[PDB]
Amino acid sequence: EIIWESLSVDVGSQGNPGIVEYKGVDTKTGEVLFEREPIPIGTNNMGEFLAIVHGLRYLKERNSRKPIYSNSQTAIKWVKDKKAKSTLVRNEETALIWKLVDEAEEWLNTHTYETPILKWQTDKWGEI
Template sequence: MAKPKPKYYVVWKGKETGIFESWDKCRIQIDGFAGAKYKSFKTKQAAESAFNKSPKDFIGKNTFESELTSEQLGKIGKPILESLSVDAAFDGDVMEYKGVYTKTRLELFKMGPFEGATNNIGEFLAIVHALALLKKQGNGPPTPKRGALYTQVSPLRGDKGGLPVYSDSITAIHWVKTHKANTKLKATSENKSLFYLIQRAEKWLKENKYPNRLLKWETKAWGENPADFGRK
């Protein structure tokens, strides 16, 4: 039988405040104390960080807690917020994809559903869609445009190479870099329009250069991709 993982309990308001390494020790501080405020965390690092912040930022909220070590998190670093993030959702053989501005989660585009697809194809199309949109609009951070799904951009650039694009699919990133969606999916009457989009995306990649970096979204360190459909 697997040994249960330890939890760390933050008590912001109780007989004594602090971080406690067992429920029994935590309970001593909150039992009989009116208005006690406390919450458990998966790692000591998360507990220490939370203890120095307001309990209202954590109590009753499903906040992400990375289970990676401090050393692992340090090597990965933090995501670049001045960027675009893309993701695909796949249910059975129906796929859709979208892209958002990472910093604000502003939705920039959403496509689908497409039948007879795969998740990696969705990620591939989403990355190319993001690159084409950035090139068309100047590679700067977006601002909302009333009445339109797409956005205008300010003249500011994300960096010297334009805004990076995040995807959590290594396969799709590789396909984009090689200008080829190397899928084993077969073309059928139901996914004819999808294969047209794939061919159009491959053609765009062969005919256009882009300065943007394609980066892997590190889910284990940062939580779900900002473009995630939230269906897991």
Template sequence: MTHKARFYVVWKGRNPGIYATWVDTEAQVKGFAGAKFKGFDSLKAAQLAFEGAAQPKAEQGALWHLTSPGGEMPEQPIPDSLSVDAACSGNPGWLEYRCLDNRTGRVVFKEGPFQDGTNNVGEFLAIVQALAWCKEKGLKLPVYSDSRVAISWVRQKRCKTNLKPTEHNQKLFALIRWAERWLAENPYDNPVLEWNSRLWGQISADYGRK
């Protein structure tokens, strides 16, 4: 069972401070780019942490960082959000990817199979397509992926794959060019978050083929 914090310190959010409930904390950090916050067992510990430093050190404990990979997440994923996942039969191999609405469980889109692809390429394309779909619909839903590599590529606006072009993956490389161009030309407000498989299990969009 996940231990629940009693107090939360928000160092970077809409209104930095100490909050007694996750609901109040989430209101300060959800959708806020670069939000930084952490849970504590006591008010005293929270006060010392908040007054002691504006930026906590990593060795002081797990920092909940909604928009960067590697940090701890809240006890549950944000319900109103999207999740993406890719499945690839080899490296390279037959690739497909999809996006799921976490509130309803509905498949928002699915693509593939594509020959001579990789899992990270699929995750990258799925994230960008989810962002493009949200922008078209006027939605600011967070997008979850369990691929740190793909999340970093999205932030850098470039698919840094070592995959080689072949006669079979020309359509896949056309999608990569589209995704990079879309990222270069379209600002977006949707947080791209890492799915915490350790706490939450397999990502909701998972193909279940592992």
């Protein structure tokens, strides 16, 4: 049922909003493929969005067709629409997450990609 030849995105937040970080891993080995240092203020929908697009770029650079597993349906929609819809206030305290979200959107509106973007069935399989 799980597609093991794939890349999984694992985003954590210390509160929503709160410190947000993420890693992209090989789904089968759990090897860390890329990561993002903690961002002091973010939401988990923003972290998933960024994590997905980071993975899209990682896979594009390496000419991989492996799919991406996310477990935020909202961030998958945001990626598909090439537009994030966060309600998070934008100021100096949130400048970094918003700047990264801007950059991710920009990348999405200037590129094409092959990667399938799948929802992790947390109900059937557990956490990643």
